[PDB]
Amino acid sequence: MISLIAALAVDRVIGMENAMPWNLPADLAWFKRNTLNKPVIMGRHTWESIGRPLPGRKNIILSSQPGTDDRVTWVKSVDEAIAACGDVPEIMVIGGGRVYEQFLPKAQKLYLTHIDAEVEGDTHFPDYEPDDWESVFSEFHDADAQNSHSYCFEILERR
Amino acid sequence: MISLIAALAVDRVIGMENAMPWNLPADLAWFKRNTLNKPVIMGRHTWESIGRPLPGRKNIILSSQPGTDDRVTWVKSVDEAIAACGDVPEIMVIGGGRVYEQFLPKAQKLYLTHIDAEVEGDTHFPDYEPDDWESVFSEFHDADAQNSHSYCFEILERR
Ligand SMILES: CN(Cc1cnc2nc(N)nc(N)c2n1)c1ccc(C(=O)N[C@H](CCC(=O)O)C(=O)O)cc1
Ligand SMILES: CN(Cc1cnc2nc(N)nc(N)c2n1)c1ccc(C(=O)N[C@H](CCC(=O)O)C(=O)O)cc1
Ligand SMILES: [Ca+2]
Ligand SMILES: [Cl-]
Ligand SMILES: [Cl-]
């Protein structure tokens, strides 16, 4: 199935005009464990934001605009990128807003990392109904030597 | 010679334990390029945050409490930290807090990065008299989709 994974700050803020204000190695860690060995779908701005193709995953970039990298699979439509992942147990949608927005109704599971970071949001996560999903996992953590903010890892499943 | 390198926030606010609330890759590039192939002195709090020894740099941790590792040099004092590096041209004192004020008096160069991160903290980078330190290099930068904040690189010769 399709699952979306995201790091939402307060008010579902998932993105700024610039980089996000924090150093969260742990969530990059949590992010990888969950996407590793799966096809990842992202938009050209998430693509261009990461910089390099994620190792050990198949990258599918969605954009009605033409491809600029020989190493990644590019796509022009939603249903098109779906086929690009092929035959797989799960697909991970990494973002952002439009990608989440379009895929969400096809999403059967969630991977929310909640961060106590009040920031002014350029982009936000589609309002996910609090009773259309069940929490099957949650783990809370405080900021430590390497992470700037408190966070709570959480996976949800559609009801 | 003893040079100190640090990244500051408004009003000279520096890390204290948990990681700092920003994401600045250029400063780590700047940091590395200036500290590499050189002996770097640090306190215990910084060392946890780095979480491992710096590559191509002789890492010296200054502490009174038992050096819990056998890869890095652990010293108990300042005159003792100094020797650990031998006779090299430059010794970088990377911090933090306390480690900074114990070493500024012997210093002759400052490697600052002034950040537009309005952070609250208790530790301050030692107050430097600008009629005792001449500014030489100074280059401003804008925040981008990779660097979360605006920042300025600066170099102060001691005068
Ligand atoms: C734009 N970007 C955003 C990114 C980060 N965390 C998320 N976290 C969640 N929970 N969801 C997302 N969609 C998400 N996206 C990035 C940036 C770097 C890497 C990357 O190199 N990270 C690790 C490696 C960690 C490292 O050494 O930098 C990886 O291999 O997945 C991935 C995504
Ligand atoms: C917490 N910490 C202390 C730290 C961080 N930024 C600073 N920035 C400046 N200007 N000055 C300092 N004294 C300083 N100290 C760190 C954290 C990570 C690395 C690090 O991972 N290594 C860098 C960069 C490595 C990389 O980007 O791959 C390096 O010097 O090799 C260094 C210092
Ligand atoms: Ca339950
Ligand atoms: Cl995008
Ligand atoms: Cl310390």
Side-chain angles (χ1 to χ4, degrees), chain A residues 1-128 130 132-159, chain B residues 1-67 69-75 77-105 107-128 130 132-158:
Chain A
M1 102 250 88
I2 297 147
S3 303
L4 272 57
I5 190 173
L8 290 71
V10 169
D11 288 282
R12 289 187 276 76
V13 178
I14 64 174
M16 250 104 258
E17 314 189 291
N18 286 316
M20 294 307 272
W22 62 56
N23 185 45
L24 311 172
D27 161 80
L28 282 174
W30 151 267
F31 171 66
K32 185 182 182 82
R33 185 160 216 93
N34 298 291
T35 64
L36 206 63
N37 314 297
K38 297 177 206 176
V40 311
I41 317 187
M42 76 198 91
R44 222 204 282 255
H45 299 0
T46 278
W47 160 243
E48 265 149 36
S49 207
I50 304 171
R52 63 171 219 270
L54 302 163
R57 269 151 292 191
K58 176 166 53 53
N59 296 180
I60 306 108
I61 328 296
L62 205 19
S63 195
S64 61
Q65 292 160 35
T68 7
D69 192 70
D70 284 304
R71 308 171 293 208
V72 301
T73 295
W74 297 79
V75 274
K76 292 292 189 76
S77 79
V78 162
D79 285 295
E80 185 169 324
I82 298 193
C85 303
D87 200 65
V88 285
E90 179 174 31
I91 303 158
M92 303 301 260
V93 172
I94 60 191
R98 297 303 290 173
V99 188
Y100 288 141
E101 198 69 276
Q102 284 130 34
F103 278 104
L104 193 74
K106 266 89 74 302
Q108 297 307 297
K109 190 177 170 193
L110 290 172
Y111 294 81
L112 306 193
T113 301
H114 317 265
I115 321 171
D116 212 59
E118 187 277 349
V119 280
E120 192 204 315
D122 167 29
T123 347
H124 315 286
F125 203 84
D127 224 342
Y128 70 90
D132 291 0
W133 305 90
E134 163 174 30
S135 319
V136 290
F137 185 76
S138 62
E139 186 175 74
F140 179 77
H141 299 292
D142 272 316
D144 40 75
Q146 290 177 63
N147 296 267
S148 63
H149 299 83
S150 286
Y151 54 93
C152 172
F153 290 144
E154 194 195 317
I155 317 166
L156 290 143
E157 254 126 20
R158 257 217 193 289
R159 288 176 190 283
Chain B
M1 71 161 281
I2 287 119
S3 323
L4 273 59
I5 174 170
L8 315 192
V10 343
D11 288 337
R12 284 142 52 253
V13 175
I14 58 185
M16 182 182 70
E17 181 167 292
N18 310 317
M20 293 292 273
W22 61 59
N23 218 326
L24 292 164
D27 171 36
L28 284 156
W30 156 272
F31 182 62
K32 184 186 203 158
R33 134 170 49 82
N34 286 253
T35 56
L36 186 76
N37 290 315
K38 288 166 182 168
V40 254
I41 302 183
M42 60 177 113
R44 183 175 262 63
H45 292 101
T46 302
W47 163 257
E48 305 318 309
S49 303
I50 304 177
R52 47 137 219 270
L54 294 164
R57 285 154 284 223
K58 163 175 46 286
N59 334 277
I60 298 122
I61 295 75
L62 221 188
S63 187
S64 278
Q65 306 308 139
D69 207 284
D70 10 54
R71 267 183 311 190
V72 284
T73 306
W74 303 87
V75 310
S77 78
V78 159
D79 343 310
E80 170 175 358
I82 294 297
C85 1
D87 240 278
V88 296
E90 206 170 50
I91 304 183
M92 300 300 273
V93 170
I94 62 131
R98 267 299 309 158
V99 176
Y100 286 148
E101 48 199 45
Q102 247 170 130
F103 273 125
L104 197 41
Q108 296 177 350
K109 260 192 196 151
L110 297 177
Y111 292 95
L112 294 176
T113 306
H114 311 274
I115 314 156
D116 291 62
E118 282 253 11
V119 183
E120 238 174 338
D122 303 293
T123 316
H124 275 228
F125 185 94
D127 187 54
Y128 57 111
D132 201 18
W133 289 87
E134 56 149 292
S135 175
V136 178
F137 169 72
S138 180
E139 172 195 10
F140 179 79
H141 294 270
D142 274 85
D144 50 51
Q146 287 81 43
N147 282 260
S148 68
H149 291 71
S150 286
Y151 55 85
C152 200
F153 292 133
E154 191 186 325
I155 297 179
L156 295 290
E157 294 300 278
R158 185 186 205 109

